[PDB]
Design a protein around this ligand. Structure first.
Ligand SMILES: [Mg+2]
Ligand SMILES: [Mg+2]
Length: 247
């Protein structure tokens, strides 16, 4: 009976889509074509997401255990089997539900400077014709959208405060079972980062994947300051320096 032994949990707009694509190419790794099932997050969801274009998080998510298990029907011989939903990191009860099902699971987290991540989410919403406001106006609506139960793609600030989200995974799974990757390193050398993930997942590292407009300056300064205390906490949690996020 095929089941997942690793999860790519987020964060959203951090480049996990490419990471998933590259890992899937490995002959010893299987990731189903379904993304954003969010099975382990469902109990943390509001009754329904109310924002424009939020239908997907209501409709395309998988809430039934049997349907979730069927995602893995395509596994054949792969040692590493994984599933990717980008708000797994954000919803606070997710790690514990996963652990209760799969205590030996490994967790991949990819993080990006949360200032850039926020702008990426904004650009995504604009491209999809969900948001017509300026980024400045869109930022100002976050509190009211959280109250109104919009989906988390809209929460520019909340989704970027990584420290507590990552701590929850480290607490539940332990440092042995969690690997945190920085988007900037992945962008610079995706082959190296993918090979590092192979080592983490315990599959062969002799693999080469086939890898084939501007925020207002005052907002960049203000958002950098907003996230700064959380970033400092995160540095201590993940044992590495984040100075690249302060430039
Ligand atoms: Mg494969
Ligand atoms: Mg613990």
């Amino acid at each position: 009976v095929a089941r997942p032994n690793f999860f790519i949990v987020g964060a959203a707009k951090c480049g996990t889509s490419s990471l998933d694509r590259y890992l899937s190419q490995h002959p010893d790794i299987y990731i189903p074509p379904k993304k954003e099932a969010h099975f382990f997050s469902i109990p943390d969801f509001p009754e329904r997401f109310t924002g424009p274009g939020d239908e997907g998080m209501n409709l395309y998510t998988i809430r039934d255990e049997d349907a979730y298990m069927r995602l893995f029907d395509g596994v054949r011989g792969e040692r590493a089997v994984g599933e990717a939903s980008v708000f797994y990191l954000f919803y606070p009860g997710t790690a514990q539900r996963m652990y209760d099902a799969y205590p030996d699971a490994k967790i991949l987290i990819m993080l990006r400077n949360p200032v850039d991540r926020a702008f990426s989410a904004y650009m995504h919403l604009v491209r999809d014709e969900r948001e017509t406001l300026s980024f400045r106006e869109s930022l100002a609506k976050e509190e009211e959208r959280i109250r109104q139960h919009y989906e988390p793609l809209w929460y520019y600030r909340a989704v970027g405060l990584y420290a507590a989200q990552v701590k929850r995974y480290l607490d539940v799974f332990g440092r042995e079972q969690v690997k945190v990757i920085l988007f900037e390193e992945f962008a610079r050398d995706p082959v190296q980062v993918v090979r590092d993930c192979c080592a983490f997942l315990g599959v062969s590292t002799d693999f080469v994947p086939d890898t084939s407009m501007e925020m207002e300056p005052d907002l960049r300064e203000e958002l950098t300051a907003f996230f700064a205390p959380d970033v400092a906490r995160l540095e201590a949690l993940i044992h590495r320096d984040l100075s690249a996020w302060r430039r």
